[PDB]
């Protein structure tokens, strides 16, 4: 079974190693079965994002209470389907931003399993 922690890294972690989002949404099996309407990639280290689980406890958008907000803003890419996007030809607008991230955390080690929001 893919673990929940591995799925968060596959969906949202692209630590550095206009067309950014079209390249990245296919690679991660996020355009493989359907066009995921919105996805955010985080360009900070896995350690800095995992650290958010020890930062400010906040309510998730849905009302779950195991979410955590990063104290600093972080470098992120929002990928959003464009009007011409239609599976299986998915297509995305890229908007780079610097925002606090909010993640839901689970497990031991206690790590992100869900990307909830950026603000």
């Amino acid at each position, epitope marked *: 079974k893919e673990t929940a922690a591995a799925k968060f890294e596959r969906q949202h972690m692209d630590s550095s190693t206009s067309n950014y989002c079209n390249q990245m949404m296919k690679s991660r099996n996020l355009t493989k079965d359907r066009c995921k309407p919105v996805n955010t990639f985080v360009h900070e280290s896995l350690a800095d994002v995992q650290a958010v689980c*020890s930062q400010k*406890n*906040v*309510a998730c958008k849905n009302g779950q*209470t*195991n979410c*955590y907000q990063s104290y600093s803003t972080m470098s992120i890419t929002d990928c959003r389907e464009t009007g011409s996007s239609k599976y299986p030809n998915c297509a995305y607008k890229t908007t780079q931003a610097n925002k606090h991230i909010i993640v839901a*955390c*689970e497990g031991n080690p*206690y790590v992100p399993v869900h990307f909830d929001a950026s603000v």
Partner: nanobody
Amino acid sequence: GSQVQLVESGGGLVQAGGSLRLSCAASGYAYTYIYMGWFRQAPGKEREGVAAMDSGGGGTLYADSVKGRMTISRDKGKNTVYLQMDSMKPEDTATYYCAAGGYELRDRTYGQWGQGTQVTVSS
């Protein structure tokens, strides 16, 4: 203190039919944990959620097996949680753990855990 600690007190040895109070206070965390709760692991069993409550005194949930004998409260301070246990049963013998920062009785969602307090209910 750079580290967060969930300090547990109370618990220990009691007769079947008796009463005990567990208390937990977090130190080292600068904000308010929205949910805190008590979990336990009894001999022969997996860890299970016993009781949980949110920082406004609501969202209260209990394991069905302890409902009506145990009472959780938080109203005595920031990041504190207490468990009053009455009419105790042999099946309540367990290591009890304070936990903070999760949601309801879902133990995977809690990221801070006390070291564990033994509670032994003598037959």
